[PDB]
Structure 1
Amino acid sequence: QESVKEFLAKAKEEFLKKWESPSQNTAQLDHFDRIKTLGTFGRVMLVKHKETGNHYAMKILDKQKVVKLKQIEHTLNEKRILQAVNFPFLVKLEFSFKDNSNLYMVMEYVPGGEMFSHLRRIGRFSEPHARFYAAQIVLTFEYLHSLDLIYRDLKPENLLIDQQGYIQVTDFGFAKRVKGRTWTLCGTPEYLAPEIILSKGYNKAVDWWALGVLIYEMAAGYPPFFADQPIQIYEKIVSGKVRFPSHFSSDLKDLLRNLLQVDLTKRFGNLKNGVNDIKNHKWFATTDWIAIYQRKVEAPFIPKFKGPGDTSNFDDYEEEEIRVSINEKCGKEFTEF
């Protein structure tokens, strides 16, 4: 429909303006009070802005460790993309800056926790619950792919649940602007598409494979390919031999066979009709795509939390210093940050 085409054309226009002229250096560390480590080359810490009182999740990357782990380009991708995107189910970057030691990305805080926590607490999501989340990912990937962005890190740990019960996708550390193919081995083993494992030039079809893994994990409670060693996971993935729980609906199994298609040229999301083969699949027949985008659907689950500074949906980590060297480190490598 023309209304969707015009939406995506405007979305790309607005992305490209920010992409071509990124914001830089929009706060500094002593504008914030450190509250708690929420997850831990990098950590995420809950901080409070000292003037406004607003809460944020501050991702901190050690420049020397980024260089050693060969993640310079990836880190620059992450911040350049995050400051340029705008979509209801993406985390909101409010500030970024750097100092002698670290890179900082300060995002609006999402107190409801990772989807992974809730999935493991409940066991598995019902198909309507899994479908509510999946629809948000389908729309988010339609948006990102229209901007020539691949995401490359879908998994329940990267999907935050907000105060309305909707998703905010976080961690763009592997996201990249790609026209055509790309080649970097990255991702999480359980979620890797076969063509990544086989060191091929691959494209945005790897995100649709990962959506199949996510939907399986949400509806079953565990991922389709797992083993104690990644090499064993990889052998299962490239076989693509998938066993479905008997409680899966026939529509769900049919969608998953088409997302977990080892031949990328036959995989849903990567055919001539693109995302519409997924949106029009029988498993999504009850989904009101517009209502999801507009956040008008009542969510199946609202996280329990007491206020915008509550950390009870995240877990406990050793609290370490945020050290800033007296000397500048790796200044040249991160000039554009």
Structure 2
Amino acid sequence: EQESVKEFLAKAKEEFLKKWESPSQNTAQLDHFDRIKTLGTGSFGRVMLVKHKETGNHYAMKILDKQKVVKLKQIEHTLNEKRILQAVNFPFLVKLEFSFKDNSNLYMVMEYVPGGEMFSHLRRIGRFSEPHARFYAAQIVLTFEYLHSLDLIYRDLKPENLLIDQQGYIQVTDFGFAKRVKGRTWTLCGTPEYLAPEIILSKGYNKAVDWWALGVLIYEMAAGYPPFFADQPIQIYEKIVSGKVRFPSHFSSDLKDLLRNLLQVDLTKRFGNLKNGVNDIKNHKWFATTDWIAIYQRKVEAPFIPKFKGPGDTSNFDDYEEEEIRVSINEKCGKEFTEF
């Protein structure tokens, strides 16, 4: 490994471990913010655009209902998410600014990324050219090199979880399945189209599942649709475990070669999981034009700058039913969330 990379990752791990061992807690409260608009929803709860009443700064506030987290069996995952987010620091990761809890809910207040989800831009344009896909892929490669060096598996890569910032760079969001793992882990989680075969087959799996998901993402960016597509999950799973994929004829030979090595069903042969680790990916011919240092330093001109009017603009996010943020007069699930 290059001395620069080695000493960078050694320092990255030292800094992560100090915050991991002593997590920040209770750094704001709900009535410090005005609620503006719902930016998205899921089983996790909701994300709202908020404005800090004193500073005027905008944030994306993820709100989880403690009782629903318990019923959906996501306690450990939610504690993982907040503890990891408060400890990481990398140019292409969403930045957690505050966290707190009250009688009913857990709150993670993040810097707001007004360019919207990669998913929207991909569906609007149709597919990205190879250079455009490669610019985003390089940022994911560097982000996974960082996360994996901290013993973190991400487990939720997909276009809806990649936001585009004001400079056209990626911010990875949604650490709801991220976990610190030395060795293997066993939980079935993630979106069907992006699951590695070893997840579908209920094996103990490792960080190689993130490199499989990178293969799916690159294919989807360059084709406009994912490589394993079907109407029901059970049919998607059959395609994933088969060891066959079809590439559009417009794909370059270098892209097809990279994808055969990322979408390798045998995890012991998959790029990212060999002796050379991430360097088999960084040194692959498809990445020959990539200036890894300049990408990290955000010195490369992005292929695309999202249109938006200012830090409060919500036009790149879609419209959701607006519901109350209720806080019970009685504490719910206090024991389960003591460490949050």
- Per the normalisation by structure 2, the TM-score is 0.99
Partner of 1:193: 196
Q: How many residues get paired?
A: 337
Deviations 1:6-36 (A, max 9, x none): 0000000000000000000000000000000
State how far apart, in whole Å, the 2-side matches of 1:222 and 1:207 are.
19
Deviations 1:277-312 (A, max 9, x none): 000000000000000000000000000000000000
State how far apart, in whole Å, the 2-side matches of 1:214 and 1:323 are.
37
Deviations 1:220-240 (A, max 9, x none): 000000111100000000003
Deviations 1:172-200 (A, max 9, x none): 00000000000000000000000000000
SS of equivalent residue, structure 1 residue 12? helix
State how far apart, in whole Å, the 1-side matches of 2:119 and 2:131 are.
17
* Over 6 Å off, 4+ runs: none
Residue 36 (structure 1) aligned with residue 41 (structure 2): no
Percent identical: 100
Shift of 1:121: 0.3
SS of equivalent residue, structure 1 residue 253? helix
SS of equivalent residue, structure 2 residue 241? helix
Partner of 1:18: 19
State how far apart, in whole Å, the 2-side matches of 1:278 and 1:46 are.
37
State how far apart, in whole Å, the 2-side matches of 1:244 and 1:45 are.
39
Residue from 266, 269, 281 that aligns with 1:278: 281
SS of equivalent residue, structure 2 residue 47? strand
Shift of 1:241: 1.1
SS of equivalent residue, structure 2 residue 64? strand
State how far apart, in whole Å, the 2-side matches of 1:117 and 1:49 are.
27
State how far apart, in whole Å, the 2-side matches of 1:247 and 1:326 are.
60
Mark the runs of 5 or more structure 2 residues left unpaired by the alignment. none
What is the correspondence of 1:28-177 to structure 2 with a 5 Å cutoff? Answer: 28-40=29-41, 41-177=44-180
State how far apart, in whole Å, the 1-side matches of 2:248 and 2:48 are.
38
Mark the runs of 5 or more structure 1 residues left unpaired by the alignment. none
State how far apart, in whole Å, the 2-side matches of 1:294 and 1:332 are.
43
Partner of 2:8: 7
State how far apart, in whole Å, the 2-side matches of 1:28 and 1:103 are.
11
SS of equivalent residue, structure 2 residue 221? helix
State how far apart, in whole Å, the 1-side matches of 2:95 and 2:155 are.
19
State how far apart, in whole Å, the 1-side matches of 2:314 and 2:30 are.
21
Residue 228 (structure 1) aligned with residue 231 (structure 2): yes
State how far apart, in whole Å, the 1-side matches of 2:297 and 2:29 are.
34
Shift of 1:106: 0.2
- Per the normalisation by structure 1, the TM-score is 1.00
State how far apart, in whole Å, the 1-side matches of 2:100 and 2:289 are.
44
Residue from 177, 182, 189 that aligns with 1:179: 182
State how far apart, in whole Å, the 2-side matches of 1:249 and 1:42 are.
41
State how far apart, in whole Å, the 2-side matches of 1:174 and 1:118 are.
24
Shift of 1:87: 0.1
State how far apart, in whole Å, the 2-side matches of 1:161 and 1:104 are.
23
State how far apart, in whole Å, the 1-side matches of 2:328 and 2:249 are.
57
SS of equivalent residue, structure 1 residue 236? helix
SS of equivalent residue, structure 2 residue 290? coil
Residue from 208, 212, 229 that aligns with 1:205: 208
State how far apart, in whole Å, the 1-side matches of 2:215 and 2:186 are.
21
Partner of 1:303: 306
State how far apart, in whole Å, the 1-side matches of 2:172 and 2:75 are.
22
State how far apart, in whole Å, the 2-side matches of 1:328 and 1:299 are.
47
